[PDB]
Design a protein around this ligand. Structure first.
Ligand SMILES: c1ccc(Cn2ccnc2)cc1
Ligand SMILES: [Zn+2]
Length: 294
């Protein structure tokens, strides 16, 4: 019926490594600016129509973040669309590290940041080469991970997180923007990771979770996409669902012992713990979903 393209895991892995090779993508650093230029340029080289959303976002403590959401659009005139999201900034503090002396050191964010973006770059390459029926938007969200440090004494507000998705959700890149549904990729490269149906995703978009997990099973990734409800996670999709009202699910790992991968918000979130086979399982599932939408 439909020939779904084959996600190239080696290609995706290299897009992950290329981001990490800039160093930490902390908002307001030259490394962040350079990586943003790399990502926008790559989308444009893969035939996307690129819209940049530069915004002055205010962090939990009053810090102004020079943020840039990057949107790459395929079949831009189609009104029938699927939105694919990943955050591209990295966290400026390894505030979950086992050693306190690292709690003020920026992470490399290989899994938390680079993995989702790298997977979506590989999807963008393939969408260009053979388009699905629906228009696809690849949306790289800034300033997701500048939320209140664990060491901070004071108010820990939910809205300190996901500043780029909040901005995008209130201020779409094109007036009247609609999508049938959305998929957010968050930490999709970790060795041995499995993905359960996330709680907010189940509450806002259970039909989309069903679609995605059925697609994974059908494509042979049923051992990676486990048909079971996991944790409820504050992530970009919460704000997208609440503010933009696009039914959006989160593909995010769940481990029974650590919840998130053990590298999460530690100085160990680097390429040593990225497995291209995890990228493959997630990326191929996303392809299976978008190419079977009519
Ligand atoms: C608290 C805040 C945010 C999250 C989600 N998240 C995803 C990547 N880094 C953090 C989980 C708990
Ligand atoms: Zn994070």
């Amino acid at each position: 019926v439909v020939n779904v393209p084959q996600f190239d895991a080696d290609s995706a892995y290299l897009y992950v490594k290329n981001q990490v090779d800039f160093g930490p993508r902390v908002p307001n650093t030259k490394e962040h600016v350079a990586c943003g230029n790399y990502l926008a340029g790559k989308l444009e080289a893969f035939g996307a129509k690129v819209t940049n959303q530069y915004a002055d976002l205010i962090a939990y403590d009053g810090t102004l973040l020079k943020a840039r959401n990057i949107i790459g659009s395929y079949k831009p005139e189609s009104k029938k669309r699927i939105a694919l999201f990943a955050h591209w900034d990295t966290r400026p503090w390894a505030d979950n590290d086992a050693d306190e002396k690292n709690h003020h050191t920026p992470i490399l964010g290989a899994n938390d940041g680079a993995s989702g973006v790298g997977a979506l770059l590989e999807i963008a390459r393939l969408v260009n080469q053979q388009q699905p029926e629906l228009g696809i938007d690849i949306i790289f969200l800034d300033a997701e991970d500048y939320g209140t440090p664990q060491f901070y004494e004071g108010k820990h507000k939910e809205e300190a997180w996901c500043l780029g998705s909040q901005y995008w959700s209130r201020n779409p890149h094109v007036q009247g923007y609609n999508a049938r549904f959305g998929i957010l990729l968050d930490m999709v490269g970790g060795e041995n990771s499995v993905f359960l149906k996330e709680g907010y995703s189940e509450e806002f978009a259970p039909d989309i979770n069903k679609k995605v997990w059925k697609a994974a099973k059908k494509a042979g990734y049923g051992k990676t996409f486990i048909d079971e409800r996991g944790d409820t996670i504050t992530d970009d999709h919460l704000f997208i669902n609440r503010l933009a009202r696009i039914k959006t699910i989160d593909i995010i790992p769940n481990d029974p012992e650590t919840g998130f991968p053990p590298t999460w918000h530690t100085i160990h979130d680097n390429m040593d713990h990225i497995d291209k086979n995890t990228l493959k399982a997630v990326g191929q599932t996303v392809l299976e979903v978008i190419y079977n939408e009519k």
